[PDB]
Amino acid sequence: KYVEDTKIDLWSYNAELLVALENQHTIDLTDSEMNKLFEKTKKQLRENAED
Amino acid sequence: SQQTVSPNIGSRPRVRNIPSRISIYWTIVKPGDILLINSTGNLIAPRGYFKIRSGKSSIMRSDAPIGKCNSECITPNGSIPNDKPFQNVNRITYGACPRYVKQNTLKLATGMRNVPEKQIENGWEGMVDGWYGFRHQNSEGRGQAADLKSTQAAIDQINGKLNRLIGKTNEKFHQIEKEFEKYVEDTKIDLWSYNAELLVALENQHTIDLTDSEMNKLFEKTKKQLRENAEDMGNGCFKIYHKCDNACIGSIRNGTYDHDVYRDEALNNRFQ
Amino acid sequence: ATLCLGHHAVPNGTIVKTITNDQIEVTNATELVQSSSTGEICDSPHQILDGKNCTLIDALLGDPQCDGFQNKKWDLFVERSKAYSNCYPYDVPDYAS
Amino acid sequence: ATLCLGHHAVPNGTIVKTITNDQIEVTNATELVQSSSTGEICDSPHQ
Amino acid sequence: VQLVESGGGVVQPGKSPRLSCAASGSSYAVHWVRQAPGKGLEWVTLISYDGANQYYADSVKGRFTISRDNSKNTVYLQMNSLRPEDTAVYYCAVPGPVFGIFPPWSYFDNWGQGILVTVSSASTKGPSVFPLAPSSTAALGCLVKDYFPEPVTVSWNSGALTSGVHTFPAVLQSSGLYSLSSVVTVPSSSLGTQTYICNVNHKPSNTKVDKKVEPK
Amino acid sequence: IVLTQSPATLSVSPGERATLSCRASQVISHNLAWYQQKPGQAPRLLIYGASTRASGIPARFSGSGSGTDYTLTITSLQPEDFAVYYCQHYSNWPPRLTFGGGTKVEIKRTVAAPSVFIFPPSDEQLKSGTASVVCLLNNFYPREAKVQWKVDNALQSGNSQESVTEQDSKDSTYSLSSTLTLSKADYEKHKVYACEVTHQGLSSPVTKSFNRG
Ligand SMILES: *[C@@H]1O[C@H](CO)[C@@H](O[C@@H]2O[C@H](CO)[C@@H](O[C@@H]3O[C@H](CO)[C@@H](O)[C@H](O)[C@@H]3O)[C@H](O)[C@H]2NC(C)=O)[C@H](O)[C@H]1NC(C)=O
Ligand SMILES: *[C@@H]1O[C@H](CO)[C@@H](O)[C@H](O)[C@H]1NC(C)=O
Ligand SMILES: *[C@@H]1O[C@H](CO)[C@@H](O)[C@H](O)[C@H]1NC(C)=O
Ligand SMILES: *[C@@H]1O[C@H](CO)[C@@H](O)[C@H](O)[C@H]1NC(C)=O
Neighbours of chain C (3+ CB pairs under 8 A): B, E, F
**Cα-trace Rg, chain A:** 22
Where are the alpha helices (H) located in chain B, listed in sequence order? Answer: 148-165, 183-226, 246-253, 263-270
Cα(B100)–Cα(B82) distance, rounded to whole angstroms? 12
Strand-pairing partners, residue F62, are: F73
Does the beta carbon of E100 sit less than 6 angstroms from any atom of ligand 1?
A: yes
Q: What CA–CA distance (Å, rounded) separates E140 from C81?
A: 68
CA distance F211 to F213: 5
C16: CB partners within 8 A, 6+ apart: B107, B108, B109, B200, B204, C24, C25, C26, C29
Q: Is B175 on the interface with A (CB under 8 A)?
A: yes
Q: Which helix (H) or strand (E) holds F188?
A: helix F184-189
Closest-CA residue to A11 (of F198, C17, B192, B117): B192
The continuous run of DSSP H or E covering D25 comes out as: strand D24-26
The domain ranges of chain E are: 1-121, 122-215
CA dihedral E183, E186, E192, E196 (to 10 degrees): -40
The DSSP letter of residue F127 is: T
- CA nearest to B175, candidates B187, B183, B163, B167: B167
**C-alpha torsion sign, points B101, B103, B104, B108:** negative
| DSSP per position, E44-58 | EEEE-SSSS-EEE-T
Distances in Å between the Cα of B23 and the Cα atoms of B12, B156, C65, F9 are: 13, 65, 20, 62
What SS3 string covers chain A?
CHHHHHHHHHHHHHHHHHHHHHHHHHHHHHHHHHHHHHHHHHHHHHHHCCC
User: In angstroms, what is the span from residue B47 Cα to ligand 4's centroid?
Assistant: 28
The Cα B214–Cα F30 span in angstroms is: 20
Give the dihedral of Cα atoms B193, B196, B201, B205; nearest 10 deg. 170
Cross-strand pairs, F98: F89
For residues E152 and E170, is the Cβ–Cβ distance under 8 A?
Answer: yes
Please, are residues E142 and E127 in contact by the beta-carbon 8 Å criterion? no
Residues B227, B259: contact at Cβ < 8 Å? yes
Q: Identify the H or E element spanning D14.
A: strand D14-16
Report which ligand 3 atom has the smallest distance to the Cα of B250.
5
CA distances from C78 to C2, C95, D25, E103 (A): 70, 17, 48, 49
Give the span between the Cα atoms of C45 and E140, in whole angstroms. Answer: 49
**Ordered structural domains, chain F, with CATH:** 1-109 (2.60.40.10), 110-213 (2.60.40.10)
In the complex, which subunits touch D with 3 or more CB pairs below 8 angstroms?
A, B, F
Instruction: Please judge whether D19 and B206 are an interchain contact, meaning their C-beta atoms are less than 8 angstroms apart.
Output: yes
CA F50 – CA F89 distance, rounded (Å): 9
Q: Which amino acid, residue C89?
A: P
Ligand 1 binding pocket includes C29 (Cβ within 6 Å): yes
Cα dihedral E6, E7, E10, E13 sign: negative
Q: Give the Å distance between the CA of B171 and the centre of ligand 1.
A: 30
Smallest Cα–Cα separation from E3: which of E107, E108, E117? E108
- Closest residue CA from atom 1 of ligand 4: C53
**Nearest-angstrom CA–CA distance, E135 and F82:** 37
Measured at the CA of F37, the angle between CA F33 and CA F40, to 5 degrees, comes to 150
Whether the Cβ atoms of residue E137 and residue E111 lie closer than 8 Å to each other:
no
The CATH number assigned to the domain with range E1-121 reads 2.60.40.10
What is the Cα–Cα distance from B104 to C91, expressed in whole angstroms? 41
Which distant-in-sequence residues (6+ apart) come within 8 Å of A18 by Cβ?
none
**Minimal CA–CA distance to F44: which of F59, F28, F31, F33?**
F33
In angstroms, rounded to a whole number, what is the distance separating the alpha carbons of residues F135 and F119? Answer: 6
Mutate to test the pocket of ligand 1, among B110, B158, B207 (most ligand atoms within 8 A of CB): B110
Q: What whole-number distance in Å separates Cα of residue A11 and Cα of residue E153?
A: 70
Nearest to B165, CA basis, from C14, A6, D20, F55: D20
> Measured between beta carbons, which residues in chain A are less than 8 angstroms from residue B178?
9
Evaluate whether E1-121 and E122-215 have a shared fold. Answer: yes
- Which H or E element spans position F184? helix F184-189
Which one-letter DSSP state was computed for residue B228? G
Q: Specify the 3-state DSSP secondary structure of B201.
A: helix
Q: With beta carbons less than 8 A apart as the criterion, state whether E83 and E13 touch.
A: yes
Neighbours of E189 (CB within 10 A): 9
Choose among D5, D18, D33: nearest Cβ to A38: D5
Cβ proximity of B112 and C6 under 8 Å = no
Alpha helices in chain D (DSSP H): none
Task: For chain F, state the CA radius of gyration.
Answer: 22
How far apart are the C-alpha atoms of C62 and B2, rounded to whole Å?
25
Burial class (CB in 10 A: 0-12, 13-18, 19+), E155: middle
DSSP secondary structure string, E120-152? -----PPPEEEEEPPP---EEEEEEEEE-SS-E
Radius of gyration of chain C measured on its C-alpha atoms: 28
Residue B41 buriedness (CB in 10 A; 0-12 / 13-18 / 19+):
exposed
* Cα B252 to averaged position of ligand 3 atoms, centre (Å): 9
CA distances from F6 to B75, F28, F146 (A): 36, 18, 22
Which CATH superfamily is E122-215 part of? Immunoglobulins (2.60.40.10)
d(C-alpha B136, C-alpha B129), whole Å: 16
Distance from CA of C82 to the nearest CA of F (A): 32
For a mutational test of ligand 1's pocket, the pick from E99, E102, E110, i.e. the residue with the most ligand atoms closer than 8 A to its C-beta, is E99
Cβ atoms of E160 and E186 closer than 8 Å: no
Ligand 1 in contact with F56 (CB < 6 A)? no
Residue F167: is it exposed, middle or buried by C-beta count within 10 angstroms (0-12/13-18/19+)?
middle
CA dist list (Å): F11 to F35, F103, F107 = 18, 10, 6
CA B229 to chain centre: 47
Distance CA B171, CA B188 (A): 24
Residue B249 in contact with residue C22, Cβ under 8 Å?
A: no
Cα distance between residue E172 and residue F161, in whole Å: 9
The kind and range of the H/E element at C60 are helix C56-61
Q: Give yes or no for residue C85 CB within 6 A of ligand 4.
A: no
Cis preceding linkage at E149, omega within 30: yes
Torsion angle defined by CA atoms of residues E25, E16, E49 and E60, in that order, rounded to the nearest 10 degrees: 140
Strand ranges, E, within chain F: 3-6, 9-12, 18-24, 32-37, 44-48, 52-53, 61-66, 69-74, 84-91, 96-99, 103-107, 115-119, 130-140, 145-151, 160-164, 174-183, 192-199, 206-211
HSE toward the beta carbon, residue E97, CA cutoff 13 A: 12
Q: What is the CATH number of the domain that holds B111?
A: 3.90.20.10
C-alpha–C-alpha distance, residues F121 and B261, integer Å: 76
**Ligand 2 in reach of B60 Cβ (< 6 A):** no
What phi and psi values does residue E85 have, to the nearest 5 degrees?
-90, 10
CA C82 to ligand 4 center in whole angstroms? 9
Whole-angstrom Cα Rg for chain E: 23
Q: Is F172:F141 a contact under the CB 8 Å cutoff?
A: yes
DSSP B97: B
CA of E100 to the centre of ligand 1 (A): 8
Quote the CA–CA distance of B229 and B238 in Å, as a whole number.
Answer: 10
**Please, which chains are in contact with B (at least 3 CB pairs closer than 8 A)?**
A, C, D, E, F
Which range marks the domain in which residue B192 is found?
65-272
d(CA F102, CA F83): 10
Q: Are strands E166-167 and E178-185 parallel, antiparallel or unpaired?
A: antiparallel
Smallest CA separation from ligand 1 atom 31, residue = E97
Phi, psi of F109 (to 5 degrees): -150, 165
- What are the counts of helices (DSSP H) followed by strands (DSSP E) for chain C? 1, 9
Q: How far apart are CA F46 and CA F88, in angstroms?
A: 11
Q: Are C50 and C82 in contact (CB under 8 A)?
A: no
d(CA C46, CA C63): 26
Rounded Cα distance between B224 and B243, Å, is 19
3-state secondary structure of C65: helix
Minimum-distance ligand to the CA of B245?
Answer: 3
| Nearest CA among A12, F147, F155, F118 for reference residue B195 | A12
**CA dihedral angle for residue B61, residue B63, residue B66, residue B71, rounded to 10 degrees:** -60
Mutate to test the pocket of ligand 4, among C49, C50, C53 (most ligand atoms within 8 A of CB): C53
Q: Where are the beta strands (DSSP E) in chain E?
A: 4-6, 9-11, 18-22, 30-35, 41-47, 54-56, 64-69, 74-79, 88-95, 108-111, 115-119, 128-132, 139-147, 152-156, 166-167, 171-172, 178-185, 198-202
Distances from the Cα of B256 to the Cα of B63, B166, B227, F186, angstroms: 68, 40, 14, 65
Question: Residue E13: what residue type?
Answer: P
Structural Rg of chain D based on CA atoms:
20
The DSSP letter of residue F147 is: E
Q: Mark out the alpha helices in F9-154 (DSSP H runs).
A: 123-126
* Contact yes or no for E139/E185 (Cβ under 8 A): yes
**Residues of chain B neighbouring D20 (CB-CB closer than 8 A):** 157, 160-161, 164, 206
Longest dimension (CA), chain B: 121
